[PDB]
Write an enzyme that holds these catalytic residues in place. Sequence first.
Site, short mmCIF file in Angstrom:
data_model
loop_
_atom_site.label_atom_id
_atom_site.label_comp_id
_atom_site.label_asym_id
_atom_site.label_seq_id
_atom_site.Cartn_x
_atom_site.Cartn_y
_atom_site.Cartn_z
N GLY A 1 2.22 -9.70 3.02
CA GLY A 1 2.70 -8.69 3.79
C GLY A 1 2.43 -7.21 3.02
O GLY A 1 3.19 -6.56 3.27
N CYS A 2 1.33 -7.32 2.38
CA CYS A 2 1.16 -5.96 1.45
C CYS A 2 -0.43 -5.77 1.83
O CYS A 2 -1.07 -6.56 2.26
CB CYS A 2 1.53 -6.01 0.05
SG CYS A 2 2.93 -7.06 -0.27
N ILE B 1 7.48 -2.92 -1.82
CA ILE B 1 7.78 -3.48 -0.72
C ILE B 1 6.80 -3.84 0.39
O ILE B 1 5.48 -4.05 -0.19
CB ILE B 1 8.22 -2.25 0.15
CG1 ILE B 1 7.23 -0.91 0.31
CG2 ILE B 1 9.68 -1.64 -0.14
CD1 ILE B 1 7.61 0.14 0.93
N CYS B 2 7.02 -4.73 1.27
CA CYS B 2 6.09 -5.54 2.13
C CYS B 2 6.24 -4.84 3.53
O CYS B 2 6.88 -5.37 4.54
CB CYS B 2 6.44 -6.91 2.08
SG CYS B 2 5.05 -7.99 1.21
N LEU B 3 5.38 -3.67 3.84
CA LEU B 3 5.27 -3.02 5.05
C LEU B 3 4.19 -3.45 5.83
O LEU B 3 2.83 -3.01 5.43
CB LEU B 3 5.69 -1.80 5.25
CG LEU B 3 6.74 -1.15 5.37
CD1 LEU B 3 8.03 -1.45 4.32
CD2 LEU B 3 6.97 0.49 5.58
#
Lengths: 76, 150
Positions: free
Chosen positions: A75-76, B83-85
């Site tokens: 998710g990056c 972070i994982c956006l």
Amino acid sequence: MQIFVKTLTGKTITLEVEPSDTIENVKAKIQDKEGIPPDQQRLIFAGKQLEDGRTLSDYNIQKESTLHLVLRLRGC
Amino acid sequence: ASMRVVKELEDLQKKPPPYLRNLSSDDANVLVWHALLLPDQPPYHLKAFNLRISFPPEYPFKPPMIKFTTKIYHPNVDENGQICLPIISSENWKPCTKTCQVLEALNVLVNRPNIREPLRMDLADLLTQNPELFRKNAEEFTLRFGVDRP
């Protein structure tokens, strides 16, 4: 045989697998109790990565073996 | 490339959101944004968190990498400040999207934690078990490794 799966969060769970148990199946067993997707399940044993198509006999894994579970967050 | 970045900054520096203050470019880099995030969610509302926005040379084809400068005890943030956006991920990104939209998404995720896909299973589990205990740990941390509330 009962093995120990330790995550990077310190959380260590007990898993019952046989020598003939495939790594892919092991991932399923982990998700069955924890819920972590197999795609994000990176099992490291003695510095080697456990291939999905390999079994516990391949890497010569005995009972009470502590595996290191690294989570692959996509998710990056 | 940097032209849009300058425009986005110029616009945001005129009408900044109530949760984003001290927004300016880096002392020696126009591709690096500096700002203080003001979360409303408890107990993050006691302090502020500085974030560093890193714009890639291939902007806006490449998503801007945002990281935290300070330390925030949030289940959606790592111990370092990563972070994982999804909005700016390699799995999903739109060049038509401006940094202002990304900042909003970030603020939303900082205020509202995601127990579905978190970065800290330990904190996520704790939050979904005892909010008070989690609050205590987060509170001390916020008033320890956090920037003062502007």
